[PDB]
Tab-separated table of C-alpha atoms (C1' of nucleotides) in Angstrom:
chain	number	residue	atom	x	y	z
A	88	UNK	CA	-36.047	274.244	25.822
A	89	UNK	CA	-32.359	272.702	26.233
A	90	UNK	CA	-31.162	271.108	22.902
A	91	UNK	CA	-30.584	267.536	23.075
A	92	UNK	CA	-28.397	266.108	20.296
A	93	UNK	CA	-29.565	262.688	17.663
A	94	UNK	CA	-27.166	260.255	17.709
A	95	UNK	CA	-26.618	261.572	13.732
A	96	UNK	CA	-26.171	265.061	14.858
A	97	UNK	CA	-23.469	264.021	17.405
A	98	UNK	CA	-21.517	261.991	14.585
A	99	UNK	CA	-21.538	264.467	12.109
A	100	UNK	CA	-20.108	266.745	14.600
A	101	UNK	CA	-17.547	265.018	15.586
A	102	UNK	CA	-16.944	264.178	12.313
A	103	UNK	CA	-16.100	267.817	11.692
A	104	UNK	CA	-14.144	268.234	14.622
A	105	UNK	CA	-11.598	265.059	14.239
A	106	UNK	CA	-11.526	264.895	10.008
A	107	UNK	CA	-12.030	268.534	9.119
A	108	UNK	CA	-10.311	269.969	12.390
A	109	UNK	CA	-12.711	272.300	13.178
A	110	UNK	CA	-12.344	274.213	16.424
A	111	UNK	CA	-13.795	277.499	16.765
A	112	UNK	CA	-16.618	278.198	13.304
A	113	UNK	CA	-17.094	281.046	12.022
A	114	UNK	CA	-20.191	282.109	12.081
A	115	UNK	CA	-20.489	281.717	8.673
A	116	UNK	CA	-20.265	277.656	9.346
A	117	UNK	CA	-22.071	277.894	12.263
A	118	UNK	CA	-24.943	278.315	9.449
A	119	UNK	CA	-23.841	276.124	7.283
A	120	UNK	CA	-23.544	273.285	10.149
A	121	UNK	CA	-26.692	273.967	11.839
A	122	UNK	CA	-28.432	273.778	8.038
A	123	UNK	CA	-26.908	270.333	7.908
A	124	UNK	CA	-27.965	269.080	11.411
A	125	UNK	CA	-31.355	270.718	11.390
A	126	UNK	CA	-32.447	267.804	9.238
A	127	UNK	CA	-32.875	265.919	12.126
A	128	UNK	CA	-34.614	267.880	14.547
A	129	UNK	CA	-34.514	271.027	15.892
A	130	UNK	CA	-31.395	273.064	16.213
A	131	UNK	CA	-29.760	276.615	16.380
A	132	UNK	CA	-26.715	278.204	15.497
A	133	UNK	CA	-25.513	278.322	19.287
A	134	UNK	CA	-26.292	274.875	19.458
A	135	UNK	CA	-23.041	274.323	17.408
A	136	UNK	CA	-21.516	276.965	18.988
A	137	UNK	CA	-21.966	275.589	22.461
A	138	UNK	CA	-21.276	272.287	20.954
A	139	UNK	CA	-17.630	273.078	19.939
A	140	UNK	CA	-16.574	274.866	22.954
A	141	UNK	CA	-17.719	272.243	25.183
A	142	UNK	CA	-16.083	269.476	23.122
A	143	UNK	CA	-12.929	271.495	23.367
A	144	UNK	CA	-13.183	271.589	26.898
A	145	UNK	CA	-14.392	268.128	26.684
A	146	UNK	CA	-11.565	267.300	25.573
A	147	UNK	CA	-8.620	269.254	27.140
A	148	UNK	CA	-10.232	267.158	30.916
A	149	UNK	CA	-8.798	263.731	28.643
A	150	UNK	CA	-5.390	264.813	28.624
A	151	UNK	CA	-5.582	265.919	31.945
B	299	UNK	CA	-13.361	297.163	15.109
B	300	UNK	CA	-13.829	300.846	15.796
B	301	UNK	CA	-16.876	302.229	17.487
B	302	UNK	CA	-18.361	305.043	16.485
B	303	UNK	CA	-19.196	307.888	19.055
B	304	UNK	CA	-23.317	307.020	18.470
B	305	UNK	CA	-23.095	303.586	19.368
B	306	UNK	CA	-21.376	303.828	22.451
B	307	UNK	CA	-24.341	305.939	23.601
B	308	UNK	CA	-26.428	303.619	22.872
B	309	UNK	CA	-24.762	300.880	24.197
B	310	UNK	CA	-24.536	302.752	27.368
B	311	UNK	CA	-27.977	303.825	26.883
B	312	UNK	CA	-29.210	300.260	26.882
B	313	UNK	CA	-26.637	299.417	29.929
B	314	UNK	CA	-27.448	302.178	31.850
B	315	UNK	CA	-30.741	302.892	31.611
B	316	UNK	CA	-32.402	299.463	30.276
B	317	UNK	CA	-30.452	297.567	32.763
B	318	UNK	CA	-29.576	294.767	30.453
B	319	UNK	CA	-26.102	292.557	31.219
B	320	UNK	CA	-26.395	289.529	29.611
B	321	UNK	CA	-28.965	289.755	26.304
B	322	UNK	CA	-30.489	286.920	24.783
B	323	UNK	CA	-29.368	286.371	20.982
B	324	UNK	CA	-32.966	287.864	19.536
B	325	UNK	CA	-32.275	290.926	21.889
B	326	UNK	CA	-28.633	290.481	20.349
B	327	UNK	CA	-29.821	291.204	16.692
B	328	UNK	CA	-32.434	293.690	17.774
B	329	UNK	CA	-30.093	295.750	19.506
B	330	UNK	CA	-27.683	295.366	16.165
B	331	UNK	CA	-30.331	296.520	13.875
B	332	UNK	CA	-30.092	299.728	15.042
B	333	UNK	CA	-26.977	300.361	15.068
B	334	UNK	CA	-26.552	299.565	11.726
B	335	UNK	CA	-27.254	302.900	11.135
B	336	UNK	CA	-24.027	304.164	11.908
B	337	UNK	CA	-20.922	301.950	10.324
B	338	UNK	CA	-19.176	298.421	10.604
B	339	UNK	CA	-20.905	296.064	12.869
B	340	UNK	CA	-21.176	292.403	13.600
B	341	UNK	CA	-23.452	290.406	16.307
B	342	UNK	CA	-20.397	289.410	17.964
B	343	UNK	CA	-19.677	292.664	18.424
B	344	UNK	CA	-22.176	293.681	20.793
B	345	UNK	CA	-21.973	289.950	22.357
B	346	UNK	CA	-18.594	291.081	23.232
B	347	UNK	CA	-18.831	294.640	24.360
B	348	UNK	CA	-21.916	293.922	26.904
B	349	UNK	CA	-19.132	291.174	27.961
B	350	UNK	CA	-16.133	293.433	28.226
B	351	UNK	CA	-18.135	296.114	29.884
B	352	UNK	CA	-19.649	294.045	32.756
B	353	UNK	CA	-15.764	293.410	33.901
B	354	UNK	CA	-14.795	296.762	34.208
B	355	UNK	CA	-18.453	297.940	36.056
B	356	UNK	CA	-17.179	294.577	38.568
B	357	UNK	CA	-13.701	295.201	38.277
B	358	UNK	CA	-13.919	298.678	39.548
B	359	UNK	CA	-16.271	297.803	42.423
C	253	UNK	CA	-31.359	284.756	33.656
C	254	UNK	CA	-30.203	281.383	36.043
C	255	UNK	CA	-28.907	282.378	39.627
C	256	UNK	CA	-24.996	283.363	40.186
C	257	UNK	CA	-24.867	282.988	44.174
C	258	UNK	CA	-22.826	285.626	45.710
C	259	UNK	CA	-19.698	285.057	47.226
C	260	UNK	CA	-21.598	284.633	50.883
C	261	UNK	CA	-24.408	283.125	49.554
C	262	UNK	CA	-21.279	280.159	48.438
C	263	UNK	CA	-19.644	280.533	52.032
C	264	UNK	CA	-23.027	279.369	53.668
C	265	UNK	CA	-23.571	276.683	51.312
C	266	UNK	CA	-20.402	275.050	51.594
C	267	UNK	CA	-20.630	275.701	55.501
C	268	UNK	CA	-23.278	273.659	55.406
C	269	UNK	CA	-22.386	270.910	53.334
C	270	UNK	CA	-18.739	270.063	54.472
C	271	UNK	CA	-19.819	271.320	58.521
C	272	UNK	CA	-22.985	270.278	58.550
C	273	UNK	CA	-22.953	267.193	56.520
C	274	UNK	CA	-25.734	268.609	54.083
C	275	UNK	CA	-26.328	266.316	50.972
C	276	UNK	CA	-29.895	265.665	50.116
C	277	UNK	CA	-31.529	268.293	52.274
C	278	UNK	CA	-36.006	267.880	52.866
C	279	UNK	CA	-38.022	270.390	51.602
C	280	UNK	CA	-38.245	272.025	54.801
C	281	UNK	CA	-34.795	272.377	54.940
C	282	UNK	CA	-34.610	273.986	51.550
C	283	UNK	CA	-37.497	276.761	53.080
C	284	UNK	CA	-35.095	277.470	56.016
C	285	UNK	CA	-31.982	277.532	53.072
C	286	UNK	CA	-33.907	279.691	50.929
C	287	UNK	CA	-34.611	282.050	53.278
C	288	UNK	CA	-31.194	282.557	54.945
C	289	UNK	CA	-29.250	283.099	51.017
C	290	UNK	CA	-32.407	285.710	50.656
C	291	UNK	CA	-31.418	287.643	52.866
C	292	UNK	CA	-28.406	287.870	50.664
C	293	UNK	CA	-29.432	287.917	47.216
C	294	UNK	CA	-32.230	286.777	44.638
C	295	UNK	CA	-32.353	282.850	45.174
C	296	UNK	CA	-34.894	280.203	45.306
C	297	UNK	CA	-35.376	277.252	46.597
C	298	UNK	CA	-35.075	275.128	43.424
C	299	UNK	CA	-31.102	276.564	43.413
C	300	UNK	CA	-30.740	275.184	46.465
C	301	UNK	CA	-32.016	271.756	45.368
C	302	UNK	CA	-30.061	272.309	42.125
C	303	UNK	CA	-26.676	273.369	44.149
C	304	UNK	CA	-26.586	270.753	46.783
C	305	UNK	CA	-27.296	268.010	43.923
C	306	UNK	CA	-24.813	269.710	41.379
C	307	UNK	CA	-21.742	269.986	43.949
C	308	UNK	CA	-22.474	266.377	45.279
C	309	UNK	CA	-21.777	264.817	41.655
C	310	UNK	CA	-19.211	267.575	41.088
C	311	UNK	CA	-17.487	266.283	44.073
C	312	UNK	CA	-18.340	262.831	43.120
C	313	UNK	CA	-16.827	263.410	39.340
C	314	UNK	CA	-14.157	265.207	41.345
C	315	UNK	CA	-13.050	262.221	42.929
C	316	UNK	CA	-12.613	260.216	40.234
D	41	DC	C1'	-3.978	301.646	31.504
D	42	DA	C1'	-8.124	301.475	27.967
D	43	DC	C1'	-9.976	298.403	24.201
D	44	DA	C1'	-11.698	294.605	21.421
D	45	DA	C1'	-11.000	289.890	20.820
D	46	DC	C1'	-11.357	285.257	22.228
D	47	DC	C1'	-9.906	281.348	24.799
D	48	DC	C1'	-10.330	278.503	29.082
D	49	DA	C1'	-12.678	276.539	33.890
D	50	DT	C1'	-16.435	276.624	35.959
D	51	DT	C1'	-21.315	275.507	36.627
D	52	DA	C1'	-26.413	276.273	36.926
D	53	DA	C1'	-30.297	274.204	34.692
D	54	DC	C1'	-32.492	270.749	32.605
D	55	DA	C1'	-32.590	266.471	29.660
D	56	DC	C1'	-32.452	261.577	30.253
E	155	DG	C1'	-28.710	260.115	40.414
E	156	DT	C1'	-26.328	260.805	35.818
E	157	DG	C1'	-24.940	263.420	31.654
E	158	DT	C1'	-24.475	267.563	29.195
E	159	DT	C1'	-26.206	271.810	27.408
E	160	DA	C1'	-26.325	276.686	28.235
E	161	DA	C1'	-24.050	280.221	30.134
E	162	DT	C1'	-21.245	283.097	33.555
E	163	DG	C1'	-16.488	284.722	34.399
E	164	DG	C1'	-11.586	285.242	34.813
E	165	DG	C1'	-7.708	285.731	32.497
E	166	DT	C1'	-4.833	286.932	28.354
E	167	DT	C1'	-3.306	288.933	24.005
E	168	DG	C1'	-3.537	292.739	20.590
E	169	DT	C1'	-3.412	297.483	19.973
E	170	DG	C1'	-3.047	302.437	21.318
DNA sequence: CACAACCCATTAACAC
DNA sequence: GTGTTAATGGGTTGTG
């Protein structure tokens, strides 16, 4: 079943992605991120994964 | 990383012979475990090999 | 695993929706889709439902 | 050229 | 219809 994100998940993410700069986890992160979001629902370590990637591309379409 | 002669047969055995392209992150692992066996190895490793070997099967045809 | 239409199996849907006019195709449609693509590759008819929905808002998103 | 490695764009599928 | 998650793929760099 697809993942849909909490408005909390989806804050904290992009918290690590604009004030911690983070890009492309390790997958080391990837388990300490998904331990963090899992708290408010459930959530897998490509969940993150897929998260970042598509922000990144998410975000390369703005400065287009 | 370097791959050691018994995991490329295996690799090629589940290519070849199991038919799988693309496997799912359990299958992933499972197919890891094994080949732990035989030296250095990370999931990523076989994400990216299964990856790597589709575009040269395509490439070449 | 999701369906990856073959390079044909793209030609005849675009055919039909930028010769044809195709948009929101009826369900008998679809069965007369479906079965031309088959004859190409492994399809079914909800990837035709799914493609001629998908490339509408990606030509929609497209344009603006 | 082969090899792992990892991006980057594209998009099918499904959630709403 | 809309939004995005879950992948598929092409291209590129590194190394030999």
């Amino acid at each position: 079943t697809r993942w849909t994100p909490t408005t909390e998940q989806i804050k904290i993410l992009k918290e690590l992605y604009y004030n911690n700069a983070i890009r492309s986890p390790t997958a080391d992160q990837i388990q300490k991120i998904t331990a963090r979001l899992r708290q408010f629902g459930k959530i897998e370590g490509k969940n993150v994964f897929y998260w970042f990637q598509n922000h990144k591309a998410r975000e390369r379409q703005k400065k287009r």
